């Protein structure tokens, strides 16, 4: 008697389960991945940080690159928090770039729509570009946050 289970099969695939942002490599080196964070954890977390992703050539890093000598193990890191926004934290040996503009390392920056981060600057032939995608679904939850219905 699985009445509720039967309906669950109706959807099958649920997009935007708890996705924060998605990283898409436009330079063709790293496979598209999706960064995610749980809402309960966000509302529960209060240590000036909920969930942060680390990117680089390190297998530990939340993001694995194609192994670039210029890029560092953990070239860059992305943090999620605030009232309802995302932040980008650069953590490379040579620096992290935003649309051609180099930002201050280990510095928090406001997220941008379809933004892109460039890394491995120094040699025109040794730079890597990454694009960041934002899940509108996630914003909806944060925008509504507390739902007025149940007492």
């Amino acid at each position: 008697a699985t009445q509720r289970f039967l309906i669950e099969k109706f959807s099958q695939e649920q997009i935007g389960e708890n996705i924060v942002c998605r990283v898409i490599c436009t330079t063709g080196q790293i496979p598209i991945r999706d960064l995610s964070a749980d809402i309960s954890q966000v509302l529960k977390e209060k240590r000036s940080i909920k969930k942060v992703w680390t990117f680089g050539r390190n297998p530990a890093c939340d993001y694995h690159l194609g192994n670039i000598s210029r890029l560092s193990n953990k070239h860059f890191q992305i943090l999620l928090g605030e009232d309802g926004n995302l932040l980008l934290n650069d953590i490379s040996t040579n620096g992290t770039w935003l649309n051609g503009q180099k930002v201050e390392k280990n510095s928090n920056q406001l997220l941008s729509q379809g933004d892109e981060i460039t890394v491995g600057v120094g040699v025109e032939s040794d730079i890597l570009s990454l694009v960041i995608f934002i899940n509108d679904k996630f914003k909806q939850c944060l925008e509504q946050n507390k739902v007025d219905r149940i007492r």
Binding site: R57, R70, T93, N94, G95, G122
Partner: peptide
């Protein structure tokens, strides 16, 4: 630290 991964640094400060 300096050993692995190429790095840069300007000599003007």
């Amino acid at each position: 630290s300096l050993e692995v991964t190429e790095a840069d640094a300007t000599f003007v400060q």
